[PDB]
Design an enzyme around this catalytic site. Structure first.
Site, short mmCIF file in Angstrom:
data_model
loop_
_atom_site.label_atom_id
_atom_site.label_comp_id
_atom_site.label_asym_id
_atom_site.label_seq_id
_atom_site.Cartn_x
_atom_site.Cartn_y
_atom_site.Cartn_z
N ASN A 186 6.35 20.52 28.38
CA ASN A 186 6.20 20.40 29.84
C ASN A 186 6.91 21.51 30.65
OD1 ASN A 186 6.67 16.95 29.19
ND2 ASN A 186 4.67 17.95 29.58
N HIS A 188 10.02 22.41 30.60
CA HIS A 188 11.40 22.08 30.93
C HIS A 188 12.27 22.68 29.83
CE1 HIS A 188 11.10 19.29 34.34
NE2 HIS A 188 9.84 19.15 33.92
N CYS A 223 18.60 23.38 34.08
CA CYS A 223 18.48 24.82 34.29
C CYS A 223 16.94 25.02 34.42
CB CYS A 223 19.04 25.58 33.09
SG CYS A 223 18.62 27.35 33.06
#
Ligand code: CHB
Ligand code: CHB
EC number: 3.1.2.14
Lengths: 264, 265
Positions: A186, A188, A223
């Site tokens: 995804n 991330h 982050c």
């Protein structure tokens, strides 16, 4: 991998790969953390998750990691087979927990253990939430109903509050950036990448003379793919350290943690 | 994994992991490259290496990668089983070659193929050299004696000379640094890390609309643990092609050059 007889936990065996081992010819803690995530995903798939439940998809909710705590007694060598057992448990409306036990497939001895805390978040707004009764009801069908803890002891290390490192840090690694391989499906940043970044500021002399026994990491904020991180470490002591990951520019905290190392 | 019946090649099956897949829910090319190295290592161990031979250990010689060439027709999805067959062949005194064939374990169809060139080097001085007769005779007993090529074709892409990218690059990713997870057991940067660094300067719009079909990478010099790298890319072209260059961030010393070919999804 397979669900156990009672259908309340999952086991999987892994053969340690050549690129998964470090300078000691044994699996790195990042390899261990990747195996924990893998057996967790296989468990979720075996009991019907997408990882989200039917009520979560309707309300646009997701699980997000709040804390990871890992204790390793022995790291498996290259070519060895490690068996990992995992299970989940509801913690009322606070969130959920996933625990793991690692064993040497040959001796059957416990070589490590881990625990993680997960909190509910709205995927769109990113706002944290308490767990609703509907989600807790469907979660209870695949979890043991009596408590089962990888770290049972009262006041154990896995629940200890971690303080915030104060400047100046004793050691630092600055300008750390994620590459595409550090992102999940995804886009991330993978949870294991933060463990690698924390460890980057441990001095090489410690890595050469000690082995990591315990790591406890809090996850405060993600982050993003275009963010830059600074990794800060201070000795608090066996050798013990206090850690802080923050954004390279404004200094926004993303993670804090502690590590405990034993001399080889 | 196991050596095949004739003992001249090795096969291993892998179940694609959750963290091994990208935005397409299929294995990344870095995952493929890691599986190729893993089955290569298991083959070397099965035939007695420790990946040096007896004569190499006596003379302080090691094998080093000169080129990697991978073509993927279909990337395996998360949870799928991929079977990879690998074998080696001597190329006289030039060096050695390791080839691979990837298949869908269910259909038995070929989903990818790869070839790599290796050269001999003295481990201490880092000086390249030709292969001696003793070493050539020693690994000949584990290799097929008639040629077996993953890329048999007459003027195939795997052997094409790669030119040097000229400044200004169309795209760049600057300040790439290896972390401890990027190093192997001997504290050398893993060969797959350079593939990741090359791909870093491909624009996101290409990654979103295309799939990587072919990558050819030359390895000229190592990136040390304390080095910093800049990744440079220029479009050379329904298919998109790029020219790549990795160089040290400071003085600009070349470490790798390569090309990629991408097909629209
Ligand atoms: O190879 C090693 O020793 C190694 C690998 C990763 C990592 O984070 C550390 Cl601290 C050490
Ligand atoms: O997830 C992806 O799409 C992905 C991952 C790695 C990589 O190098 C590229 Cl170009 C893309």
């Amino acid at each position: 991998g397979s669900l156990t007889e009672d259908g309340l936990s999952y086991k999987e065996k892994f053969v340690v790969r050549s690129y998964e081992v470090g300078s000691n010819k044994t699996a790195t803690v990042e390899t261990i953390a990747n195996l924990l995530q893998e057996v967790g995903c296989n468990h979720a798939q075996s009991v019907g998750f997408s990882a989200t439940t039917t009520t979560m998809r309707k309300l646009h909710l997701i699980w997000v990691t709040a804390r990871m705590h890992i204790e390793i007694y022995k790291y498996p060598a290259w070519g060895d087979v490690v068996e990992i057992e995992t299970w989940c448990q509801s913690e009322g409306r606070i969130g959920t927990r996933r625990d793991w036990i690692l064993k040497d497939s040959v001796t059957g001895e416990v070589t490590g253990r881990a625990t993680s805390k997960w909190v509910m978040m709205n995927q769109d707004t990113r706002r944290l939430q308490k767990v609703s009764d509907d989600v807790r009801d469907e979660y209870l069908v695949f979890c043991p109903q009596e408590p089962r803890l990888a770290f049972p002891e009262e006041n154990n290390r896995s629940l200890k509050k971690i303080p915030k490192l104060e400047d100046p840090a004793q050691y630092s690694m600055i300008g750390l950036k994620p590459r595409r391989a550090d992102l999940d499906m995804n886009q991330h940043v993978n949870n294991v990448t933060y463990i690698g970044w924390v460890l980057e500021s441990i001095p090489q002399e410690i890595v050469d003379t000690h082995e990591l026994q315990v790591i406890t990491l809090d996850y405060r904020r993600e982050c993003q793919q275009d963010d830059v991180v600074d990794s800060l470490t201070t000795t608090t002591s066996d050798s013990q350290f206090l850690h802080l990951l923050r954004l390279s520019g404004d200094g926004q905290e993303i993670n804090r943690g502690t590590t405990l190392w034993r001399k080889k």
